[PDB]
Symmetry: C3
Subunit: 404 residues, 3 copies
């Protein structure tokens, strides 16, 4: 029952220690408090009444911002995003390109505005400050952790960019992990626009800040000594819109290609598999069969572990956006397999993260531009940081399933 979850949490911690760079250098206060916060935060907003009300209150505000932004895309694409689309095309009336992608544009502009007004820096300074006083982590790596709740892995270190070129290997690794453990505000609203419960997305985004530091300081403890703008608000929105547009195009091209490639792979796997009496062999079968123990370990029922593995596996070997796209039909009344509400929550939390191999290349570009002489260290710690980010997402899912 609940005993299988606590074992899950133990196993995840165990792997991180086995993969640590120095188990004897692990700060017990740091990693103890880090797990304490993520677990308590999970308990707070998923179990206790007052915490649940604050979460559903924040989520409804996020849901209101999404609808407001939809006025923009409604103007541009008109009746192609209206209700008449469902009367004509039925299910295919929902055009992903016009329904989900424009959200990335609006939210990138909004967060750009919130940075200009100092609202973002205000929240980050509070959360980032609470972490470093409780965990003993450095100032810079804690701010980047807190920022990563709302923005992406390449945008979060920007709030501490003059400290990045000279921060320690453990600091840099943590910064990498904070980005891999979390997502971004823009894609968040995208996933929400696909049917993913906002309550789970907001919850997972916040639990990423302590969770990211947790596995950063487990797998790479501090063995060194750390240290220590647009002209107007309209320009900020325009710049954010531009950045969002570029991101929207990239995600769209990736989804067309990757899905197309998976369709090509499934065709080949059917022919190759047929040679071994398995003509029905697909990529989803391999991934499900391979990740089922991992899904079963984080709290997914035995009879649903394989289907859960398909999504968790797809997120790891590609990215969370593709995983969510294949998991979204399972959130409607036209779902091929009716899953339990607890399993739906676990997958939602386990997928909520940029933790994949492709993000290393993205970290080399973004985070590497802030410190060009540190691109070697980033590439070297890349895979370890991806694993650490994966453990953080899996821990958050285990915690989530435990309190649900």
């Amino acid at each position: 029952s609940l005993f299988m979850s606590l074992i899950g949490m133990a196993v995840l911690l165990g792997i991180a220690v086995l993969l640590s760079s120095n188990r004897k250098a692990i700060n017990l206060r740091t990693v103890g408090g880090a797990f304490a916060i993520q677990f308590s935060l999970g308990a707070f907003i998923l179990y206790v009444p007052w915490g649940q009300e604050l979460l559903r209150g924040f989520s409804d505000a996020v849901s209101n911002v999404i609808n407001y932004g939809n006025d923009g895309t409604s103007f541009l694409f008109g009746g192609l995003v209206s209700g008449k689309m469902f009367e004509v095309f039925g299910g295919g009336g929902f055009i992903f390109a016009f329904r989900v992608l424009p959200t990335l544009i609006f939210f990138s502009a909004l967060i750009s505005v919130l940075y200009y007004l100092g609202v973002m820096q205000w929240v980050i300074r509070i959360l980032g400050g609470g972490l470093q006083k409780a965990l003993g982590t450095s100032r810079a790596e804690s701010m980047s952790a807190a920022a990563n709740i709302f923005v992406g892995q390449t945008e979060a270190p920007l709030v501490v960019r003059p400290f990045v070129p000279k921060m320690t290997q453990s600091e840099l690794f943590a910064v990498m992990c904070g980005g891999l453990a979390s997502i971004a505000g823009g894609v968040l609203a995208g996933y929400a626009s696909m049917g993913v419960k906002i309550e789970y997305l907001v919850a997972a985004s916040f639990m990423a800040a302590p969770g990211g530091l947790l596995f950063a300081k487990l797998m790479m403890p501090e063995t060194e000594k750390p240290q220590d703008k647009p002209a107007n608000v309209i320009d900020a929105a325009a710049g954010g819109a531009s950045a969002g547009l570029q991101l929207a195009l990239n995600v769209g091209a990736m989804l067309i290609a990757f899905i197309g490639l998976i369709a090509l792979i499934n065709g080949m796997l059917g022919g190759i598999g047929g040679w071994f009496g398995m003509p029905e062999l697909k990529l989803e079968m391999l991934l499900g069969w391979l990740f089922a123990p991992l899904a079963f370990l984080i709290g997914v029922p035995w009879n649903e572990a394989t289907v859960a593995g398909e999504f968790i596996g797809l997120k790891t070997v590609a990215n969370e956006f593709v995983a969510y796209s294949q998991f979204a039909p399972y959130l409607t009344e036209a779902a091929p397999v009716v899953l339990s509400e607890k399993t739906k929550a676990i997958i939602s939390f386990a997928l909520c993260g940029f933790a994949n191999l492709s993000s290393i290349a993205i970290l080399l570009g973004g985070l590497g531009s802030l410190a060009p002489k540190r691109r070697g260290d980033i590439a070297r710690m890349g895979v370890k940081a991806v694993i650490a980010g994966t453990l953080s997402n899996l821990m958050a899912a285990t915690i989530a399933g435990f309190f649900l």
Copy 2:
């Protein structure tokens, strides 16, 4: 009656003199003739029969070019831009993304072709030469003024780019003002595709050349001494298409974000306003209430000044593209408020200009790349140049309303 318009023209001139860098250095021949041309040009093509026929003749040619270009977008988006769209989605059958944006691509390619053939340089040389002989303005600043009738604020100085790094502060300011007072050929056809009367757009584009110089030489008189390609036609079209595409994407992202942001602001203004007994408070109400005196001053009737202020205000605090997008429904039979034909003309002229704060950043990029050591002067004169450009648009509207 007509007395309120002439007062309007006087007030606008008055503000420019009060904000001048040296009232004693103002060249009476320059600013006298500049106003004389803009006023006479307004009289010519809006009042006298022969001038009205030349304007409607040029506009019908512009309207024919638009339809020819529509063959391109009709090929790409097929039935999504056909008449069947209105039978199915009704009003929402008009998809802005496919109906207006592709025009920017076609017209950018066409103007690129016209530059290659020397047709553009031919017209600019005549109009630019007539201005400098009548106003006494320098050669370079006059060519940039004439070019700005047809192209954008960053493209117009390109016809005199080797003279920009060494031109006087008054010359540079004028170049900045010529761009802010006018629009571009590409967006022109876009506004026309939204229901804005082409006759008003062409008229305002031409009146921008003397009007831009007028307020440039009022607010910043000359106190110094001024001085003095693609391989084939198919390459020119391709390059122009590419530039148009990039612009089309930017405008689209901006419209999605800005409209979405306004929707978000109106939601917040309803809550904040509710604290003061004004739950119906919106951005349009603030802008209308604040710009109504200005609209009333340029010739808009008292009972229509507030609605007119909403659009003029939105153009100033954001850009003219967003203003036109909110003003276009007022040009159809489904308009929420039926406005007088004179008020519709005034708003059309007052909106026709790139005069906004965001254009300073764009001027720093485009015009600043032509003279990197002059980016300080551009940023310093930015706001003054925006005001000057605003006065030029307001003057053109007052003149327009006077002869109508």
Copy 3:
């Protein structure tokens, strides 16, 4: 009958010799074997039974990959690419922007993957090696020839990029010609998605490798002495997707502008032509009237030579993508002129090539970046290389019509 084709082949060879840089330096083994291979390859896969089966087998595999990739665009654009589109908009239900353009994205990602796995380098090394052993051409120029079968003119030299800056003028010219004589895998599937028979596209792509070398070594014989990566597979796909997206946007903007420009030209040609009693004068009439002898020479019947000339002419003076777009309606049951199956094949082969003037600018960018000190030689040999590429496409069409 078949005598008119062999005359055609002779004439094409004749022009190349007349335009040669040194007729006395032409290697008879090189150009003899080069024509021998292209002619035999044509005989193999268009005439002999076994060769026809291998071609239709490869084409059905290409047709299967296309459909697999379509799962990606089907996810993004939903019902806008469904069968319901034809029930509502009829013929206009086929939206080119969503039906053809996304193919460039998928195929660019796939070929990027195939390069990473070493599959591309494996095939190129075999075909490129067979050519240089049979023709006596250099190693580098032969690999670029073989690569050009599957990829574009700027991508093909990348497999021999450290040998490009120091290769001979004849080598560089051949590299330029190999790219101009062929197309790319991505646009190939695009043309196939417009109704162009895949069998003709695959055939022409392969016959371009010897055909490109053939006219390279005729018009520019060797008079000198020649010499002699993404972190993971998912990164490769993502990079290829990005490159495909950029290309998809460019092609789309070009098609909107060029078609729009042609519509504008036809309007002007109707007025200008009206002055000489020819109000029905259009661009298609001029191009058809001017290229009809050329089409008649390559095997197109007298009564179909003029219509065939319209398409061949449009490909030359613009690009093959625009030509195919105007030729595609002639491949359906709603064709304005029912053409013979042999004429449809000839046009398909004659159009299959990047041979146009605009590609010189593209060669200056791509191939010129690999050897910046050789941009002068590229620009100098540009037009000659375009002619050579045109002759290669015309030869392939003549050969095709001969065996059909």
